[PDB]
């Protein structure tokens, strides 16, 4: 269970082809739909994780 | 600041790559390098990342 | 061409951006040098270099 959770949590640090691993960076850097493009990559990656 | 630059000279092309132009006054600039060069009008479209 | 970095050096340029007083112990939104987030702020014992 520790190996599973410390993988599930550590996958939050992964980029999945977005501009950053941390969602607040995207929301504080880009705007309009160009931000949501990167958010959909993070959603798909974190969801599959 | 860029809002004090419209009164001195009317900019014909103000496009910011990788950052929104309306979010420049909401962040903090870091290491601003001025790269000025005069080229032909038929070569401005080639200058792009 | 104006080239500048984001979140790679301490603040020294910035822009015409309002800065608040600090608050502690409350749940708050925060923005430190462009690091936007939400949480509780306190002192710390942490031995930062």
UniProtKB/Swiss-Prot annotation, chain A:
Parent-record interval covered: 955 to 1003 of 1273
What name is this protein filed under?
Answer: Spike protein S2'
Coiled-coil spans are: 1-39
Q: Which domain of life is it from?
A: Viruses
Sum up the protein's function in the record's words: Subunit of the fusion protein that is processed upon entry into the host cell. Mediates fusion of the virion and cellular membranes by functioning as a class I viral fusion protein. Contains a viral fusion peptide that is unmasked after S2 cleavage. This cleavage can occur at the cell membrane by host TMPRSS2 or during endocytosis by host CSTL. In either case, this triggers an extensive and irreversible conformational change that leads to fusion of the viral envelope with the cellular cytoplasmic membrane, releasing viral genomic RNA into the host cell cytoplasm.
UniProtKB/Swiss-Prot annotation, chain B:
Q: Return the annotated region ranges for Integrin-binding motif.
A: 40-42
Per the UniProt entry, the effect of residue 10 to P is: In strain: Omicron/BA.1, Omicron/BA.2, Omicron/BA.2.12.1, Omicron/BA.2.75, Omicron/BA.4, Omicron/BA.5, Omicron/BQ.1.1, Omicron/XBB.1.5, Omicron/EG.5.1
What happens on changing residue 45 to S? Answer: In strain: Omicron/BA.2, Omicron/BA.2.12.1, Omicron/BA.2.75, Omicron/BA.4, Omicron/BA.5, Omicron/BQ.1.1, Omicron/XBB.1.5, Omicron/EG.5.1
- Top-rank taxon of the source lineage equals Viruses
Q: What happens when you mutate residue 8 to L?
A: In strain: Omicron/BA.1
What outcome follows a substitution of residue 12 to F? In strain: Omicron/BA.1, Omicron/BA.2, Omicron/BA.2.12.1, Omicron/BA.2.75, Omicron/BA.4, Omicron/BA.5, Omicron/BQ.1.1, Omicron/XBB.1.5, Omicron/EG.5.1
What is said about its interaction partners and assembly? Binds to host ACE2. RBD also interacts with the N-linked glycan on 'Asn-90' of ACE2. Cleavage of S generates a polybasic C-terminal sequence on S1 that binds to host Neuropilin-1 (NRP1) and Neuropilin-2 (NRP2) receptors. Interacts with host integrin alpha-5/beta-1 (ITGA5:ITGB1) and with ACE2 in complex with integrin alpha-5/beta-1 (ITGA5:ITGB1). May interact via cytoplasmic c-terminus with M protein. May interact (via N-terminus) with host bilirubin and biliverdin, thereby preventing antibody binding to the SARS-CoV-2 spike NTD via an allosteric mechanism.
Q: What does this protein do?
A: Attaches the virion to the cell membrane by interacting with host receptor, initiating the infection. The major receptor is host ACE2. When S2/S2' has been cleaved, binding to the receptor triggers direct fusion at the cell membrane. When S2/S2' has not been cleaved, binding to the receptor results in internalization of the virus by endocytosis using host TFRC and GRM2 and leading to fusion of the virion membrane with the host endosomal membrane. Alternatively, may use NRP1/NRP2 and integrin as entry receptors.
UniProt-recorded name of the protein: Spike protein S1
Name of the encoding gene: S
- Shown portion of the whole protein? 364 to 412 of 1273
């Amino acid at each position: 269970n520790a190996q599973a959770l410390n993988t599930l949590v550590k996958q939050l640090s992964s980029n999945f082809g977005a501009i950053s691993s941390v969602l607040n960076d995207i929301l504080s850097r880009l705007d309009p739909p160009e931000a949501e493009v990167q958010i959909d990559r993070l959603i798909t990656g974190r969801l599959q994780s | 600041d860029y809002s004090v630059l419209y009164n001195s000279a009317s900019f014909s092309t103000f496009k910011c790559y990788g950052v929104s132009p309306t979010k420049l006054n909401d962040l903090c600039f870091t290491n601003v390098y001025a790269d000025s060069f005069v080229i032909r009008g038929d070569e401005v479209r080639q200058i792009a990342p | 061409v104006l080239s500048f970095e984001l979140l790679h050096a301490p603040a020294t340029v910035c822009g015409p951006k309002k800065s608040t007083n600090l608050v502690k112990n409350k749940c708050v939104n925060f923005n430190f040098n462009g690091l936007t987030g939400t949480g509780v702020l306190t002192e710390s014992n942490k031995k930062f270099l």
